[PDB]
């Protein structure tokens, strides 16, 4: 199959060029830039994408959470966890001039937490010892290398047969038999792993079979091209089942997003358009001697015999893409001054739009402007007069059609456009909807069917075509009045193709409901678009008589229909995570009103929807940027009730009930400045120097005094810095020894460690900025409150006093500033005491468990 | 954007005063400041528009 032949600049061709939905992807977005304006493979990738997401690992081994250093003595070494410098290394600078920023830095803060905390073991592995079954060193939570050489004999020994009593213990569980051992791991991410085993301890195979069972209802609905069950190798008892997500989704969560319309559309577009070719009634005219083709004079022959190019190709398939979506797409005319042809071409668009397109009834794909323009051609047509001469009865008005033609009086009144009933379109008493089944999708139930047909025709005809040619036979124009009736099966078979892709390839989650669908008309009539929004096209005047000489054959299907639900269900989980976090950063505002910044619906949506897939992200700006929202919007989605359960939603909800403690995440208030000598070795005796080392750190040990200190809040200091004695003020009172708190807002600090002397920046920065701008301003030099701080952990290397050229710091200096942190990251313990970690239950599934969920697996497709 | 409230820039204001800023005091200029930043930006409806 392939499509007739049409003109490219002097040479005919009949290649398909791109893509159907690939063309509607770059036609939609290019008229929303243009609307703004005052990649296409890239985000049809990133959709299908959303079906790869993965959130639960499975790992060989838990990841290490700790590690020690070492320092010339036997009896303590220093130990330090890992988290909280993973923790702390995925900050950002904040400021409480961008709240924004703020709460995307803390959305990117929780992500964070969840996604080390989800994890799960499958094949960990064993050594033996005696006939005990024993874990091997490197399974577990705490990595030990370098204490081993430099430790006492004695220490060593009992260190080693300690290690070597990590027995595996057995037991079993609702899987039958598991391995059950200690560990050791740090508090929020085991907390995520404990919510993440007891869910998984949780049965729903009775939810498995409902999904089952909803897939094949769908399945056999669709079974003109869906067909898959795989069931019959599922059951084995040496499986574990991780019901991840509900497949049953609801379409009132993703349809209660505002201003979606769009959106929805677009990805409709993505995940079920199909891909066809454009044929002629009768293949291979376009061959055949001119001569031929052109019979006689006349307007319908003068447009016989022309051949389109790729503009009005383009714009034939903008009028199918419109055609077979009813009520998103309408259209209207491209009108610039720089035309000039004939008006034979106007007048048959005119005659033929009336066929082509429908109006009033229950749904209309055209404007009051475009009907009036078909209207007043067709008037312009039936009273143009060439060959004959015949009499006319006009009407009291000036109006288009108030006139009655023939040597019968016939009243061509009827056709003039009205939306009420659509008399001169095809929904002129004409029934288009009906309703069959409950539809596998609650929400769609409609059944559109244009011309009063169903797939499930020879030689019928319609209402609206009878009296088209009721007019003709009136007006005397049998030439095209015999055209059109030996034309009218292919018009009847073509919109049966197109009725057969509406009802059966489109039906999806993100159809339009149905009350939305009755009452767009009343909005469009109305004016005010309070509800759903459509988009209009543009396209030429020719386009409609090749529209009509051509038709659409369906050769390649949409291969993203295979995973649609998937993806459909994953997205919906999105939303109810995102709507989650609004929720829970509304709520922690609330709870910490005197150091949060406060913010507007509008910041907390621009937050969360930083952190988001890319797909997501892109939909809703395009949707967004199309058309507008306020903050009642977001008030009041913000308040629905409709949640999608899911292990990612269950995850989210314990990574906040973790992130309760805020200063756990990283975050503090407590920055201080004071004058501290920086301690320097001594570098004269070696071999003292040798057996001791020295390390250092501008740690807080202990919160400062409540006398001798002072604060100050950031409109104190924005004042003192407006007034010019900012310095002045921090000089005499640092003269007078005492502490200072840059405390009201929340400051992320960074920790990093040392192992020579650093740059001077690190080791004597300031907290803020002060920048002397250009004089005759209103406010003077201005200062940034928050800028990077990092905690910093020096442990000099003793190898290196040979060359002290890189450990001399040339001139003393003094240390500014200091942090307090209450939570313990680095602290010196003595080795009799270094295994007192090893306090949480390890789980772990056999190696011969076979773990996996079908529907990520389905995704063969064979 | 003032403690989470919309606040136009001082110079849309039509009122010239860069001149007098050196010479007001501490609490002077704490007072002007006060007065000047707390005049927030309302929302309206003008013939159904925001």
Same mark, same amino acid.
């Given at each position: 199959i392939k499509t007739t032949p049409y003109l490219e600049g002097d040479v005919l061709s009949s290649d398909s060029g791109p893509l159907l939905s690939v063309f509607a992807l770059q036609e939609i977005m290019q008229k929303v830039r243009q609307v703004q304006a005052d990649d296409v493979q890239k985000i049809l990738d990133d959709i299908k994408a959303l079906a790869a997401e993965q959130v639960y690992k499975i790992v060989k081994v838990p990841s290490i959470s700790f590690r020690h250093i070492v320092m010339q003595s036997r009896d303590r070494v220093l130990r330090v966890d890992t988290y909280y410098e993973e923790m702390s290394q995925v900050g950002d600078v904040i400021t409480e001039d961008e709240p924004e920023k703020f709460y995307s830095t803390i959305i990117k803060k929780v992500r964070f937490i969840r996604g080390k905390g989800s994890f799960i073991l499958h094949d960990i592995p064993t050594r033996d010892h005696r006939g005990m079954e024993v874990a091997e060193p490197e399974v577990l939570g705490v990595e030990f290398k370098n204490v081993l050489p430099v430790l006492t004999a004695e220490h060593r020994a009992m260190i080693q047969n300690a290690l070597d009593g990590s027995i595996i213990e057995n037991g079993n569980v609702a899987t039958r038999d598991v391995d059950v051992f200690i560990g050791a791991c740090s508090e929020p991410v085991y907390r995520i792993y404990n919510r993440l085993q007891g869910y998984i301890e949780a049965v729903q195979l009775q939810e498995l079979r409902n999904s089952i069972g909803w897939l094949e209802r769908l399945g056999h609905r669709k079974r003109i091209t869906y067909s898959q069950e795989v069931l019959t190798d599922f059951r084995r008892q040496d499986t574990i089942w991780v019901l991840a997500l509900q497949l049953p989704v609801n379409p009132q969560v993703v349809w209660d997003v505002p201003r979606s319309s769009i959106a929805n559309l677009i990805m409709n577009i993505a995940t079920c358009l199909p891909t066809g070719e454009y044929i002629?009634?009768?293949?291979?005219?376009?061959?055949?001697?001119?001569?031929?083709?052109?019979?006689?004079?006349? %307007?319908?022959?003068?447009?016989?015999?022309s051949t389109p190019t790729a503009q009005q190709l383009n714009d034939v398939r903008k009028i199918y893409l419109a055609l077979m979506f009813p009520g998103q797409?309408?259209?209207?005319?491209?009108?610039?001054?720089?035309?000039?042809?004939?008006?034979?071409?106007?007048?048959?668009?005119?005659?033929?739009?009336?066929?082509?397109?429908?109006?009033?009834?229950?749904?209309?794909?055209?404007?009051?402007n475009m009907a009036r323009q078909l209207d007043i051609a067709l008037n312009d047509y039936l009273l143009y007069m060439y060959n004959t001469r015949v009499q006319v009865n006009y009407g009291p008005t000036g109006e288009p059609l108030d006139f009655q033609i023939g040597r019968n009086q016939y009243d061509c009144n009827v056709f003039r456009a009205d939306f009420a009933t659509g008399t001169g379109y095809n929904g002129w008493a004409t029934i288009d909807v009906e309703y069959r089944e409950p539809a596998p999708y609650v929400h769609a139930q409609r059944y559109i069917r244009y011309c009063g047909i169903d797939s499930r025709g020879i030689g019928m005809t319609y209402h609206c075509y009878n009296e088209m040619l009721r007019m003709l036979v009136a007006a005397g124009k049998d030439s095209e009045a015999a055209y059109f009736r030996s034309m009218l099966p292919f018009h009847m078979v073509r919109f049966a193709r197109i009725n057969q892709i509406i009802n059966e390839d489109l039906h999806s989650v993100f159809s339009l409901p149905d009350d939305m669908f009755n009452a767009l008309l009343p909005d469009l009539i109305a004016g005010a678009h309070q509800n759903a929004d459509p988009v209009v096209l543009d396209v030429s005047w020719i386009s409609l008589w090749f529209a009509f000489n051509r038709s659409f054959e369906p050769t390649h299907r949409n291969e993203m229909l295979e995973v649609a639900p998937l993806i459909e269900s994953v997205y919906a989980s999105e939303l109810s995570v995102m709507k989650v976090d609004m929720r829970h950063l509304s709520l922690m505002q609330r709870r910490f009103p005197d150091v949060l910044i406060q913010a507007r619906p509008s910041h907390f949506w621009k937050a969360?929807? *930083?952190?988001?897939?890319?797909?997501?992200?892109?939909?809703?700006?395009?949707?967004?940027? #199309?058309?507008?929202? *306020?903050?009642?919007?977001?008030?009041?989605?913000?308040?629905? %009730?409709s949640l999608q359960p899911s292990l990612?939603?269950?995850?989210?909800?314990?990574?906040?009930?973790?992130?309760?403690?805020?200063?756990?995440?990283?975050?503090?208030?407590?920055?201080?400045? #004071?004058?501290?000598?920086?301690?320097?070795?001594?570098l004269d005796d070696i071999e003292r120097f040798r057996q001791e080392g020295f390390y250092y750190t501008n740690m807080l040990e202990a919160p400062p005094e409540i006398d001798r200190v002072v604060q100050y809040t950031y409109e104190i200091a924005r004042l003192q810095a407006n007034m010019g004695q900012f310095r002045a003020a921090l000089r005499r009172i640092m003269d007078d020894d005492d502490w200072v708190r840059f405390g009201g807002v929340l400051r992320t600090v960074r920790v990093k460690f040392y192992d020579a002397r650093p740059p001077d920046d690190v080791l004597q920065g300031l907290p803020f900025s002060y920048d002397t701008n250009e004089r005759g301003g209103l406010a003077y030099a201005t200062i940034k409150y928050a800028t990077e701080t990092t905690i910093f952990y020096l442990i000099? *290397?003793?190898?290196?006093?040979?060359?002290?050229?890189?450990?001399?710091?040339?001139?003393?200096?003094?240390?500014?500033?200091?942090?307090?942190?209450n939570k313990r990251i680095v602290e010196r313990v003595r080795v009799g005491q270094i295994l007192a970690v090893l306090n949480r239950r390890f789980v772990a599934y056999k190696g011969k468990m076979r773990i996996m969920d079908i529907t990520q697996s389905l995704k063969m497709g064979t």
């Open positions: 002629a009634p009768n293949p291979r005219i376009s061959s055949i001697t001119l001569t031929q083709r052109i019979t006689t004079t006349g %307007p319908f022959a003068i447009l016989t015999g797409i309408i259209l209207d005319l491209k009108i610039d001054p720089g035309e000039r042809m004939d008006p034979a071409v106007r007048m048959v668009a005119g005659v033929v739009g009336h066929l082509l397109f429908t109006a009033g009834g229950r749904f209309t794909n055209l404007t009051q969360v929807l *930083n952190d988001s897939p890319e797909a997501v992200k892109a939909v809703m700006n395009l949707s967004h940027s #199309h058309n507008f929202i *306020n903050i009642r919007d977001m008030m009041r989605w913000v308040m629905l %009730p990612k939603l269950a995850l989210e909800e314990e990574a906040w009930a973790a992130a309760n403690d805020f200063e756990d995440l990283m975050l503090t208030d407590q920055v201080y400045m #004071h004058r501290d000598m920086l301690p320097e070795p001594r000099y *290397n003793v190898e290196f006093s040979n060359t002290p050229d890189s450990l001399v710091l040339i001139n003393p200096t003094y240390t500014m500033t200091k942090v307090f942190i």
